[PDB]
Amino acid sequence: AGRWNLEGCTALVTGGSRGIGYGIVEELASLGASVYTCSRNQKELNDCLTQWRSKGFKVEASVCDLSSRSERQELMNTVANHFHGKLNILVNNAGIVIYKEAKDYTVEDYSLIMSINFEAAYHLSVLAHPFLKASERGNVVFISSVSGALAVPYEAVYGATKGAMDQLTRCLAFEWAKDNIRVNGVGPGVIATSLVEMTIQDPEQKENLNKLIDRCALRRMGEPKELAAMVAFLCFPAASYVTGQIIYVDGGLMANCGF
């Protein structure tokens, strides 16, 4: 791969059937990477494959329920074989939200969000490690959230899963440095995705989202490609001195207090 592209790089992006994950798959592939993705719907994935391949992108995808430990192991096995045991990039993007106040969460809600948002990202990273190392130039990017550092209504537990992810990001940057793997996190602010489309369905959640956008310096939602651009950069050989960082792509939301 050249200084500003990913020509010849292999990548695995979790949850790439829509939203941010979809934009990340497009960005990485358009920059020359060979991409592999997953989601829980085969039909959806196949329609994504048809669009991507129509653009000349090298992409492959298979169904995987990241909430399942055995399914994750199966996914990594499949990917390793598909890439010949060499994986340059791992983007832990899949995630879900359960809008409830902390005390209204059930054991099932908690277990589900924790397994998909944090455990899956942690598990998959460890599973990918030998292939990232074998690649000799590995990159692990976690997709966090501003909600992992600051209070947002109905995101106490969702925020906790991201807070755990952020700390894991910092530590892995040090534990895997000798393996030539850089590890960073990208925290999106409000990005127009299906998750957001379903959110504004609720009038209260719609109003809560409007607050966020207004606390943005740019006062507008970001686009998946605006988030994907940062993820792509961190993978470029050009970003070789960047590691252990959690970068926010939020239109200035994190820098705000009274605006």
Ligand X SMILES: NC(=O)c1ccc[n+]([C@@H]2O[C@H](COP(=O)([O-])OP(=O)(O)OC[C@H]3O[C@@H](n4cnc5c(N)ncnc54)[C@H](OP(=O)(O)O)[C@@H]3O)[C@@H](O)[C@H]2O)c1
Ligand Y SMILES: CN1[C@@H]2CC[C@H]1C[C@H](O)C2
Q: Does 66 bind ligand X (CB under 6 A)?
A: yes
Single out the residue of 59, 175, 186 nearest to residue 125, CA to CA. Answer: 175
Nearer to a copy of itself, 100 or 225 (CB): 100
Q: Is 59 annotated as a binding residue?
A: no
What's the distance, CA 97 to chain centroid? 14
Minimum distance from CB of 222 to ligand X (Å)? 8
Q: Out of 157, 221, 239, 253, point to the residue binding a copy of itself (CB under 8 A).
A: 157
Active site residue 99: no
Q: Which of 122, 158, 241, 248 is catalytic?
A: 158
Minimum distance from CB of 195 to ligand Y (Å)? 6
Q: Does 17 bind ligand X (CB under 6 A)?
A: yes
Q: Is 21 annotated as a binding residue?
A: yes
Single out the residue of 186, 251, 171 nearest to residue 219, CA to CA. Answer: 251
Q: Tell the burial category of 152 from Cβ atoms under 10 Å away from its Cβ (0-12, 13-18, 19+).
A: middle
Using CB under 6 A as the criterion, which residues of the chain lie in contact with ligand Y when the complex forms?
97, 145, 147, 152, 190, 195-196, 199, 209
Q: Is 34 annotated as a binding residue?
A: yes
Nearer to a copy of itself, 26 or 119 (CB): 119
Q: Out of 225, 244, 245, 256, point to the residue binding a copy of itself (CB under 8 A).
A: 244
Which residues are catalytic, by number? 158
